[PDB]
Amino acid sequence: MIQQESRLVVADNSGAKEALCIRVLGGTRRRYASVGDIIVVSVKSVIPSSDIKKGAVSKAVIVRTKKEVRRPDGSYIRFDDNACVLLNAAGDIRGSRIFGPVARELRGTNMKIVSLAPEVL
RNA sequence: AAUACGUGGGCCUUGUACACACCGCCCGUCAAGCCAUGGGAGUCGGGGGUACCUGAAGGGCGCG
């Protein structure tokens, strides 16, 4: 459950550390985004000598949600943070590593290259 | 014919920042062209220090 002005951890090896959600894409008055949803972000903090600049508007895919997500088999998963991965214009990973676990729902989001993740839960 | 003869050159000394020689040299501002370098709301880095919190391996100390 991520909305406009929510702050997310950036869970890849690109320069960004924190991001701010500008917009949830997908329709008029679409309020919330969950794992596997695409959002627009503004980069809030970077590491020194970062490829991406502070204040850069970018796209991202949500990979971890504090609010729990329901699976059709009656199971639920929730994480301790809210984390996203930045994307380029083509819709591909901007970086090369993924830090922390990612949700299993990302397999079906045509986002298979996040198989860089240490563990898919 | 008239009319009074007293008010630019040479010699000696002196100063010189001139020696094409005072029709000389020469300062400073404004304007023009290149070069280097100061101040500045801020903003971006680099490694070191202090304190705190976490904390591997391997010894020590009493499965911690």
Nucleotides of B under 7 A from a protein CB: 44-46
Secondary structure (3-state) at A119: coil
Q: Taking Cα atoms as reference points, which of A51, A59, A46, A110 lies closest to residue A87? A: A59
Cα–Cα distance between A116 and A72 in angstroms, integer? 25
DSSP characters for A49-111?
A: S-SSPTT-EEEEEEEE-SS-EE-TTS-EE--SS-EEEEE-TTSSBSSS-B-S-B-GGGGTTT-
Q: Please list, residue by residue across A5-41, b when 16 or more beta carbons sit within 10 angstroms of its beta carbon and e when fewer do.
A: ebebbbbbbbbbeebebeebeeeeeeeebbbbbbbbb
CA dihedral over A7, A8, A14, A15, signed as positive or negative: positive
Q: Are A76 and A68 in contact (CB under 8 A)?
A: yes
Q: How far is the CA of A32 from the C1' of B37 (A)?
A: 58
Smallest CA–C1' separation from A48, nucleotide = B45
**Residue A107 φ/ψ, nearest 5 degrees:** -65, -45
Q: How far is the CA of A120 from the C1' of B60 (A)?
A: 41
Q: What angle do CA A81, A93, A20 make, to 5 degrees?
A: 45
Cα–Cα distance between A116 and A18 in angstroms, integer? 20
List residues with CB under 7 Å of strand B: A 46, 48-50, 54
For chain A, give the number of residues: 121
Phi-psi label, residue A34: left if phi above 0, alpha if psi -120 to 50, beta otherwise: beta
**What one-character DSSP code corresponds to residue A4?**
T
Resolution in A: 2.7
Secondary structure (3-state) at A121: coil
Secondary structure (3-state) at A114: helix
Q: Are A49 and A61 in contact (CB under 8 A)?
A: no
Residue A23, Cα to own-chain centre: how many angstroms? Answer: 13
